[PDB]
Symmetry: C3
Amino acid sequence: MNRAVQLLILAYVIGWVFVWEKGYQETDSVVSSVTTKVKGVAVTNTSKLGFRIWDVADYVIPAQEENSLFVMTNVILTMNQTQGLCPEIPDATTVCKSDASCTAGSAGTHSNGVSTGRCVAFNGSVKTCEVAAWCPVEDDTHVPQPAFLKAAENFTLLVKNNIWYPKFNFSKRNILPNITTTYLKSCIYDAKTDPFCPIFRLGKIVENAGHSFQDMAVEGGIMGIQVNWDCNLDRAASLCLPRYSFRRLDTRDVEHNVSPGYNFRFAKYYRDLAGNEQRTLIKAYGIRFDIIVFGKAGKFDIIPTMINIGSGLALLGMATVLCDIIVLYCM
Amino acid sequence: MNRAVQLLILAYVIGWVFVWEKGYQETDSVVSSVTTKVKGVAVTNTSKLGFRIWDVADYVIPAQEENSLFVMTNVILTMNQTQGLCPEIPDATTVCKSDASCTAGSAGTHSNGVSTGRCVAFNGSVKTCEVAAWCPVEDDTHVPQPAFLKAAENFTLLVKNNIWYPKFNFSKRNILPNITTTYLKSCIYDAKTDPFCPIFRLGKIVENAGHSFQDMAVEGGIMGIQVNWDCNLDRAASLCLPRYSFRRLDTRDVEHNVSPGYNFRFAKYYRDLAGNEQRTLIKAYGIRFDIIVFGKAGKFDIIPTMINIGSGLALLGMATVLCDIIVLYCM
Amino acid sequence: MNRAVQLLILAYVIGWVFVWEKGYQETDSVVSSVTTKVKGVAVTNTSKLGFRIWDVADYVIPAQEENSLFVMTNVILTMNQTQGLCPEIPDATTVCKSDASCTAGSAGTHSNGVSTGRCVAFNGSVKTCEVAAWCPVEDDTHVPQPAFLKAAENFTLLVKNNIWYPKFNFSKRNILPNITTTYLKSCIYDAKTDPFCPIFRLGKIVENAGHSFQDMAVEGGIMGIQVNWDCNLDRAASLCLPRYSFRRLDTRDVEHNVSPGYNFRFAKYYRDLAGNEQRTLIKAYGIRFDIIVFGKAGKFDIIPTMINIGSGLALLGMATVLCDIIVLYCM
Ligand SMILES: *[C@@H]1O[C@H](CO)[C@@H](O[C@@H]2O[C@H](CO)[C@@H](O[C@@H]3O[C@H](CO)[C@@H](O)[C@H](O)[C@@H]3O)[C@H](O)[C@H]2NC(C)=O)[C@H](O)[C@H]1NC(C)=O
Ligand SMILES: *[C@@H]1O[C@H](CO)[C@@H](O[C@@H]2O[C@H](CO)[C@@H](O[C@@H]3O[C@H](CO)[C@@H](O)[C@H](O)[C@@H]3O)[C@H](O)[C@H]2NC(C)=O)[C@H](O)[C@H]1NC(C)=O
Ligand SMILES: *[C@@H]1O[C@H](CO)[C@@H](O[C@@H]2O[C@H](CO)[C@@H](O[C@@H]3O[C@H](CO)[C@@H](O)[C@H](O)[C@@H]3O)[C@H](O)[C@H]2NC(C)=O)[C@H](O)[C@H]1NC(C)=O
Ligand SMILES: Nc1ncnc2c1ncn2[C@@H]1O[C@H](COP(=O)(O)OP(=O)(O)OP(=O)(O)O)[C@@H](O)[C@H]1O
Ligand SMILES: Nc1ncnc2c1ncn2[C@@H]1O[C@H](COP(=O)(O)OP(=O)(O)OP(=O)(O)O)[C@@H](O)[C@H]1O
Ligand SMILES: Nc1ncnc2c1ncn2[C@@H]1O[C@H](COP(=O)(O)OP(=O)(O)OP(=O)(O)O)[C@@H](O)[C@H]1O
Ligand SMILES: *[C@@H]1O[C@H](CO)[C@@H](O[C@@H]2O[C@H](CO)[C@@H](O)[C@H](O)[C@H]2NC(C)=O)[C@H](O)[C@H]1NC(C)=O
Ligand SMILES: *[C@@H]1O[C@H](CO)[C@@H](O[C@@H]2O[C@H](CO)[C@@H](O)[C@H](O)[C@H]2NC(C)=O)[C@H](O)[C@H]1NC(C)=O
Ligand SMILES: *[C@@H]1O[C@H](CO)[C@@H](O[C@@H]2O[C@H](CO)[C@@H](O)[C@H](O)[C@H]2NC(C)=O)[C@H](O)[C@H]1NC(C)=O
Ligand SMILES: *[C@@H]1O[C@H](CO)[C@@H](O[C@@H]2O[C@H](CO)[C@@H](O)[C@H](O)[C@H]2NC(C)=O)[C@H](O)[C@H]1NC(C)=O
Ligand SMILES: *[C@@H]1O[C@H](CO)[C@@H](O[C@@H]2O[C@H](CO)[C@@H](O)[C@H](O)[C@H]2NC(C)=O)[C@H](O)[C@H]1NC(C)=O
Ligand SMILES: *[C@@H]1O[C@H](CO)[C@@H](O[C@@H]2O[C@H](CO)[C@@H](O)[C@H](O)[C@H]2NC(C)=O)[C@H](O)[C@H]1NC(C)=O
Ligand SMILES: *[C@@H]1O[C@H](CO)[C@@H](O)[C@H](O)[C@H]1NC(C)=O
Ligand SMILES: *[C@@H]1O[C@H](CO)[C@@H](O)[C@H](O)[C@H]1NC(C)=O
Ligand SMILES: *[C@@H]1O[C@H](CO)[C@@H](O)[C@H](O)[C@H]1NC(C)=O
Ligand SMILES: *[C@@H]1O[C@H](CO)[C@@H](O)[C@H](O)[C@H]1NC(C)=O
Ligand SMILES: *[C@@H]1O[C@H](CO)[C@@H](O)[C@H](O)[C@H]1NC(C)=O
Ligand SMILES: *[C@@H]1O[C@H](CO)[C@@H](O)[C@H](O)[C@H]1NC(C)=O
Ligand SMILES: *[C@@H]1O[C@H](CO)[C@@H](O)[C@H](O)[C@H]1NC(C)=O
Ligand SMILES: *[C@@H]1O[C@H](CO)[C@@H](O)[C@H](O)[C@H]1NC(C)=O
Ligand SMILES: *[C@@H]1O[C@H](CO)[C@@H](O)[C@H](O)[C@H]1NC(C)=O
Ligand SMILES: [Mg+2]
Ligand SMILES: [Mg+2]
Ligand SMILES: [Mg+2]
């Protein structure tokens, strides 16, 4: 029976290690560079803003990032803001009846300005505390619904991924060598029809993750594009191909709805004829697209092979002899 | 005694491996997304700049980043810069007595413009070489002390961290489900009183790292916020909690004081009525806050358990039999 | 012979493990922070743009990044763009003979505006479809050659790298303590003469990677600066030194030339006296410099040493006894 036992061990070393686990290969991780470009135009003709055009230079903030990009889907605008004194937005906290309620220097965390201790009139019927800030102050109580830039559902995104394995002298990109300019000009990614077109539609990205673009566009969120490289360098180089998957990354609270979506504030600065600073305040809601790249390569190397061989041999002998010892003890 | 030896080995496999090392669990790394928001307003009434307001759109450059943010604490401003010809800032190098000293095209690395080979008068008493640049040139010899935006010590920062373990289908955020909006509106992190409030005060961040905010605010630096997730997925999901620690990341030289702090330059561009380009040059000193997230999860899996079991068995037999061989040789 | 065999095993444990592999050391990975600064000025006197000055605030977009930076080398400018109606750039697709060819709402992915269904005259001889966009539309058919900002070859880049090993309480930077301000003011990196000056010239960076800066500057690309830390903490702290290498990261297609270089679009916004929005559209070509830091440290620890010792002992006995068993079977 010893011979039988030793054989099973031989099976383990040959089938599970060298074949199943490819113990004959050396492994390495990937170094990746990602660049993105978005195309699409949105047109709005609201009464307050008039006729507006939104192109790539308008809704992508900033122009370029690393492994990420942000696309604006909803917006609140405050134009003609100047440094001075103004009343606050009326609420349960800022409403005052006299100067006694207001305290000078009450610069809280949520106050967009520094209170001057004076109770001034926001309009004819309400009176609020006066602050020193950019005036008039922003009113963000009514987020637009549906999204202001809901046409972003039909925008397209090109992902250019350059991967490099420093150990094996192997580099390539996700734009395959058999892709032409004519094909790249009019291709949209699909898992079945165009699995290697590197151009994705944003609405399709959100839908493939199991969500709805129009629901997510009102307040924003985080979407994760996962690129996977599983290349065996013993094969041809044309068989090292990427795989794409999508997942929503921001966790949503439905019991309390604490801190939903994703937004930030930025401004565009101007000057008048007199030289005074002026600005437009922009509260931007939108979706951030993170590109996550995983990849490992394998190439045949003699060292790992030999190491495993020795281990298997040792293992076999030890086991067989262990079995022999146990058999005599049982006898 | 063989029985005794085999027993000790049994102890090793049961106590150190399965229990202490949790060999019965499969492990995975974390995928994290970090978003930040800063609140706070600073007011200055200097003579040169007049009355100014600094809000989040003014001192955070750029509006949003990935795993990082920059807050301005000190500033030098050069307003009304136009492209043309101007003298350099007087020093030991730019001061000239005649056009012979100046050489045309002497565009060095530290020259903010290209020298035209002419010696012009900086003012009535000093004469410096003429350059072609944005004029007038910046004078950064006197860094303001104390910091211009020293009120940034009292600003607050919200950190939103979304973590995902791809292997186990587990995702959550650092804003716990038992945190409400009322609590989040007025909470400040403290290791003892509020260990899970995700809002930190910048001065407290710098102080908890063993430093002083006012000293660091004059020239800037790098501060590292470390988030640690140590979650055992066999337990309840509410026990996967983050831990926060802080450390200053920029190494300071005190023997020579070579390249201290952290600063960069950026500009705001304007136009006049005639269409000529005009700009304000801004040299910004401040602190960069890097968010570093570490996390590993563990969940029970049968494979690792069995593997360890086999190893322990093998080990035991081999050892016991090794001891038996050694005993006979000693005899 | 048993004694001989056991001896060879002793050699393995002593020479390959403890000495060659340093099994007596505990290992750790690095946490790195990278900051960059670029110096250099370019002057152009083209007929369309007039006299222009390009300083660090003009060609670095954005002002600061994380582990990366972008330097502009070529540019196409479209000034005085306003929202309205204008014809498209003539080509094989936009040229129309009547309003029947144009379809209203034909907002494609490659259309910079939304077609209004009208065929208007681009100039006296050609007629193209009308779109609603920022007008006039950009004409990017003729990329300037040689590069507009080809003087960027002589710009210099300072890399400040702060590394930290959390396990061993060891931190330092790539600006060595024996580097002075006088040396840092006028040093350029060279592998033989100045191997530790942290200031690199961009043209030299591209040349050391095996390429030409002027060829790469017309359309741009990605360049990778690799920093390597190989520190043995048992030695003196002054011997933990960085090593620099360079590699081009963007893969180029020469058979089809699909998606070459690297570029993006951004705008500068202005207002007129009447309050209408106006902008300058900028298509920027340039090189992105990615800083990649690898580092592992080793310090003596008793645990790893003991573990290896035990393994070696076990190994020796098992092997020697395995050989003894095999010998009797052969007999
Ligand atoms: C360029 O080379 C790539 C190879 O990386 C070609 O990809 C191939 O694309 C076709 C069409 O999408 C795939 O066929 C598919 O087969 C599945 C069944 O396996 C079927 O369900 C689909 O409907 C489709 O017929 C093919 O699998 C894929 N090759 C792979 C994945 O290795 C691509 O077509 C080439 N393009 C050109 C223009 O030559
Ligand atoms: C929401 O759930 C968290 C659980 O993750 C609650 O955290 C708990 O907070 C309290 C109060 O800060 C901690 O009590 C502390 O105990 C230490 C001694 O261990 C003491 O020195 C402190 O002064 C304080 O009393 C408690 O340990 C902590 N739970 C943990 C760490 O598991 C939080 O209170 C909950 N919030 C609400 C509003 O229910
Ligand atoms: C500051 O300390 C560093 C040590 O990290 C000094 O680096 C040393 O620089 C010199 C000059 O570049 C190197 O000498 C070189 O030797 C090779 C042969 O090994 C030769 O081919 C070169 O032409 C050059 O002579 C030296 O190896 C290097 N030390 C190392 C690498 O450990 C640096 O010089 C110090 N600076 C000052 C101002 O003291
Ligand atoms: N840096 C900060 N300091 C203190 N509170 C903050 C900070 N950032 C956000 N908050 C508060 O946390 C809550 C949820 O944050 P969130 O930004 O998602 O909501 P929000 O309505 O967009 O916040 P806000 O409009 O006040 O900027 C808000 O009530 C907000 O006031
Ligand atoms: N890209 C660069 N090329 C050459 N020298 C540089 C570069 N960046 C910085 N330096 C020099 O390195 C030294 C230290 O850098 P650091 O930026 O910290 O000081 P600094 O006074 O803020 O620099 P500067 O004001 O000239 O921009 C300075 O003397 C600076 O001139
Ligand atoms: N987001 C996108 N959606 C669709 N097509 C795209 C997108 N980004 C780029 N492309 C197309 O891919 C091709 C190669 O991209 P690339 O940007 O390198 O060339 P380009 O001439 O600079 O592109 P363009 O000038 O149209 O912005 C171009 O024909 C471009 O139109
Ligand atoms: C995105 O594009 C699709 C297709 O171009 C739009 O879907 C069509 O929209 C038109 C009106 O523009 C409707 O008449 C059609 O019934 C829609 N469906 C189809 C199948 O054609 C879609 O509305 C666009 N999304 C936007 C603009 O947000
Ligand atoms: C890693 O791969 C690159 C790409 O093949 C090699 O670059 C070649 O380098 C030689 C000598 O420097 C040149 O003659 C070739 O023209 C280069 N090829 C290309 C495509 O540019 C590089 O040498 C490889 N590295 C090593 C260590 O062999
Ligand atoms: C940050 O805020 C604290 C508390 O609001 C300030 O500390 C107080 O400042 C006032 C003046 O504004 C003094 O009268 C008090 O004596 C200070 N201490 C206390 C305990 O109240 C602090 O000055 C602020 N830091 C700034 C503005 O840089
Ligand atoms: C990973 O976890 C998510 C979250 O639980 C799973 O998403 C569910 O998917 C099913 C089918 O697609 C839906 O019916 C549920 O509504 C989803 N849940 C939520 C909360 O959105 C996802 O299926 C899991 N992945 C796998 C492979 O099981
Ligand atoms: C980068 O700088 C070098 C040296 O400063 C320039 O090379 C010289 O340029 C001058 C003209 O400015 C020529 O007369 C010399 O013959 C060039 N060579 C040498 C060795 O001096 C180089 O032209 C610059 N590159 C630019 C401006 O793109
Ligand atoms: C890690 O290293 C730092 C730097 O040496 C240590 O910081 C010292 O901390 C003590 C007590 O907090 C201070 O008295 C020293 O002045 C600090 N040194 C410096 C240079 O700032 C830190 O304590 C170390 N960490 C541990 C756990 O020992
Ligand atoms: C925008 O809407 C107004 C109101 O109907 C209309 O008068 C105007 O012509 C529209 N804009 C354009 C560019 O047609
Ligand atoms: C003043 O403003 C508040 C808040 O928007 C509003 O409720 C109130 O009706 C306004 N009063 C008048 C007279 O417009
Ligand atoms: C800047 O200077 C020009 C003249 O050089 C002047 O016309 C303009 O008003 C100035 N701008 C400001 C903001 O003072
Ligand atoms: C700023 O200081 C000046 C000088 O004291 C003062 O006249 C002015 O009123 C101050 N600004 C404001 C908004 O009060
Ligand atoms: C000219 O400027 C230099 C440098 O700031 C200064 O030292 C000198 O006193 C100035 N001369 C006059 C007359 O203002
Ligand atoms: C841009 O054109 C408008 C008229 O369309 C003109 O008033 C303005 O002066 C121009 N701007 C520049 C910078 O030439
Ligand atoms: C730019 O070139 C023109 C044309 O030769 C010249 O008149 C002008 O003086 C040049 N610019 C400068 C600043 O000299
Ligand atoms: C009109 O523009 C097209 C495209 O640039 C050009 O080919 C053509 O010669 C132009 N016609 C006239 C009359 O300028
Ligand atoms: C903003 O308001 C000022 C007066 O406060 C006015 O002079 C200016 O024209 C306004 N700007 C716009 C764009 O309406
Ligand atoms: Mg709000
Ligand atoms: Mg300086
Ligand atoms: Mg084009």
